[PDB]
């Protein structure tokens, strides 16, 4: 969708970038010996104990829960309309980025 | 042998330089050392992989 209006309210215009990106549900892939960046939006190799080709060493592994929620529900004030959008909750178990092998956010602006 | 039988004292020849272009002095020594010795030594560390596939270092 195209933009009605943006602003770069003296912004250090990399600042900008990854604060467009945290809203537009991409990540960055910067890759080294090139200029080369490959955006792509958040969506194997299978190294094992009994593999013979990768070596291990440590691995390190958090777990955390604190800042993990279950539904981001968002929603902002339409001009338009004036009913204060409706509330797109989001489901958790979408884009899982760990899958093992064995409470509810929510804020409303004003705009 | 094979000449003669005179004895070879050693030098201790010394530079400046990493090289050869700089002399400093240089000294032979009476009295050969009757011995000498030279130790070699490599420093190997053993692999802690967690796969154990392997042992190596």
Not at chain 1, 34 to 52: C, Q, Y
Not at chain 2, 29 to 49: G, H, S, V, W
Request: with cysteine.
């Amino acid at each position: 969708s195209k933009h009605d209006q943006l602003l770069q309210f003296r912004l250090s215009d990399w600042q900008f970038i990854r604060s467009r990106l945290l809203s537009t549900n991409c990540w960055l892939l910067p890759d080294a010996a090139s200029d080369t960046v490959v955006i792509r939006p958040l969506s194997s190799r299978t190294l094992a104990r009994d593999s013979h080709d990768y070596t291990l060493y440590e691995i390190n592994l958090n777990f955390d829960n604190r800042f993990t929620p279950d539904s981001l529900s968002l929603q902002g004030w339409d001009i338009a309309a004036q009913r204060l959008t409706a509330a797109q909750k989001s489901p958790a178990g979408a884009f899982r980025p760990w899958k093992p092998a064995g409470q509810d956010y929510a804020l409303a602006f004003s705009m | 042998s094979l000449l003669e039988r005179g004895l070879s004292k050693l030098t201790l020849n010394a530079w400046k330089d990493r090289e050869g272009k700089i002399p400093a002095g240089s000294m032979s020594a009476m009295y050969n050392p009757e011995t000498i010795q030279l130790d070699y030594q490599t420093r190997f560390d053993t692999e802690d992989t967690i796969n154990t596939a392997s042992q190596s270092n």
